[PDB]
Write a protein that binds this DNA or RNA. Structure first.
Length: 50
DNA sequence: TGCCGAGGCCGCTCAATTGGTCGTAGACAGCTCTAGCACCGCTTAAACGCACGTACGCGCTGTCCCCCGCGTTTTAACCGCCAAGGGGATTACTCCCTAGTCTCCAGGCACGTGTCAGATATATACATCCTGTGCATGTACTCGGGATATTG
């Protein structure tokens, strides 16, 4: 049974659709997995203010 | 009449700009770096651009049908003005304080290297999440009639 990384952060937003998005805006180099979990929850958190 | 009074043209003297000449001091141009490490040339096995009916989606098209535009003029005060008054923004000076220079002096840390790890990428298998689709009601809407608020 697969989990989802959204549940391990505790977030409603898609932590793995981000990551794949960031990996397309990246010079020629990679992106840490712990970036998607404070990339998200600093896009959610504008929702629930907007 | 008178007188003269009031009247209208021309060399000193001073006070900014303007352009000139003096001399001297770092800072610019250039050399040789030399030195080295990037550009190139030379292969390779490579990804990704690209020239090209057809299904067909929608951009554009020929109609009628009405408000908001279009036109007028009264007026209404908005907006402009001028002139006066008061002060507060301004000017010119004297005293004053520190901005700025230099110089000495230390160690803080930004700089740099020296090793090599926990990081994240990439593959394959894959299950699952998420999209596109199809599908009832529930509301937010437009209307009509009356109450409350506010303008003149």
């Amino acid at each position: 049974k697969a989990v989802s990384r959204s549940q391990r952060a505790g977030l409603q937003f898609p932590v793995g659709r981000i990551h794949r998005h960031l990996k397309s805006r990246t010079t020629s180099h990679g992106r840490v997995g712990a970036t998607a979990a404070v990339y998200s929850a600093a896009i959610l958190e504008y929702l629930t203010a907007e």
